[PDB]
Write an enzyme that holds these catalytic residues in place. Structure first.
Site, short mmCIF file in Angstrom:
data_model
loop_
_atom_site.label_atom_id
_atom_site.label_comp_id
_atom_site.label_asym_id
_atom_site.label_seq_id
_atom_site.Cartn_x
_atom_site.Cartn_y
_atom_site.Cartn_z
N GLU A 35 1.02 -1.18 0.11
CA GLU A 35 -0.12 0.04 0.07
C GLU A 35 0.83 1.16 0.06
O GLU A 35 0.48 2.25 -0.83
CB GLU A 35 -0.95 -0.07 1.09
CG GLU A 35 -1.96 -0.99 1.24
CD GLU A 35 -3.33 -0.68 0.23
OE1 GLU A 35 -2.97 0.37 -0.43
OE2 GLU A 35 -4.01 -1.26 -0.08
N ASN A 46 -7.34 9.05 -5.38
CA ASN A 46 -8.32 8.17 -6.10
C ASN A 46 -9.00 8.89 -7.16
O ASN A 46 -9.12 10.11 -7.07
CB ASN A 46 -9.26 7.37 -5.14
CG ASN A 46 -8.24 6.68 -4.30
OD1 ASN A 46 -8.68 6.82 -2.92
ND2 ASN A 46 -7.26 5.92 -4.63
N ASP A 48 -12.42 9.08 -7.60
CA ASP A 48 -13.33 9.59 -7.06
C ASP A 48 -13.42 10.99 -6.43
O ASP A 48 -14.05 11.38 -5.66
CB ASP A 48 -14.27 8.69 -6.10
CG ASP A 48 -13.48 8.19 -4.83
OD1 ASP A 48 -12.40 8.71 -4.84
OD2 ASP A 48 -14.09 7.37 -4.09
N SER A 50 -11.55 11.12 -3.63
CA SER A 50 -10.48 10.84 -2.46
C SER A 50 -9.24 10.69 -2.48
O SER A 50 -8.75 10.67 -3.64
CB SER A 50 -11.41 9.81 -1.66
OG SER A 50 -11.17 8.42 -2.52
N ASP A 52 -6.03 8.49 -0.43
CA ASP A 52 -5.66 7.38 0.45
C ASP A 52 -4.15 7.78 1.22
O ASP A 52 -3.27 8.69 0.73
CB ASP A 52 -5.16 6.36 -0.15
CG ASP A 52 -6.24 5.35 -0.65
OD1 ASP A 52 -7.39 5.71 -0.36
OD2 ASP A 52 -5.95 4.37 -1.40
N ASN A 59 -8.57 5.64 3.33
CA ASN A 59 -9.41 6.68 2.37
C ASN A 59 -9.96 7.55 3.17
O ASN A 59 -10.82 7.46 4.14
CB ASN A 59 -10.38 5.76 1.31
CG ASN A 59 -10.81 6.46 0.46
OD1 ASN A 59 -12.01 6.90 0.72
ND2 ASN A 59 -10.01 6.73 -0.61
N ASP A 101 -15.30 -3.98 9.71
CA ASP A 101 -16.58 -3.61 9.25
C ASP A 101 -17.45 -4.72 8.81
O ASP A 101 -18.59 -4.93 8.64
CB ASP A 101 -16.33 -2.28 8.20
CG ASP A 101 -17.44 -1.46 8.07
OD1 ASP A 101 -18.52 -2.09 7.63
OD2 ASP A 101 -17.24 -0.32 7.87
#
Ligand SMILES: [Cl-]
Length: 129
Positions: A35, A46, A48, A50, A52, A59, A101
């Site tokens: 990562e 990213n 969209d 957003s 990281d 995110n 989650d």
């Protein structure tokens, strides 16, 4: 801060990630390697809008607030900048919420694509742990 491999392993173990939700410590080191390449200051936008953040690339759409992501949820209730500290405490606490989650570590695309189903234990071999 750019962690060494065994240095990050010891820190993730100290913070209780080894076997957290059934994921051995090798899975977390492998995920951080791919990562962020062990770099706490890593940031990547990213598609969209957003971004990281940090050693585990958490995110800004759902987990932290960077003040520029529409529809932000900040479920970890922290500024994203806290995920870039040399102290990985903030990234670890948020990672614990993420992996709990529902999708497990599949939430990390790099873990799914480059760690899942491999010899993840190799990522802690040779480390005095
Ligand atoms: Cl392991």
């Amino acid at each position: 801060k750019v962690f060494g491999r065994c240095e990050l392993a010891a820190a993730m173990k100290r913070h209780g990630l080894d076997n957290y939700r059934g994921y051995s410590l090798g899975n977390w080191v492998c995920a951080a390697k791919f990562e962020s390449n062990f770099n706490t200051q890593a940031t990547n936008r990213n598609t969209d809008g957003s971004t990281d953040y940090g050693i585990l690339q958490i995110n800004s759409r759902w987990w932290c607030n960077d003040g520029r992501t529409p529809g932000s949820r900040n479920l970890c209730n922290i500024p994203c900048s806290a995920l870039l500290s040399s102290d990985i405490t903030a990234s670890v606490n948020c990672a614990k919420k993420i992996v709990s989650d529902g999708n497990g570590m599949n939430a990390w695309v790099a873990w799914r694509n480059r760690c899942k189903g491999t010899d993840v234990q190799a990522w802690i071999r040779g480390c005095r742990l």
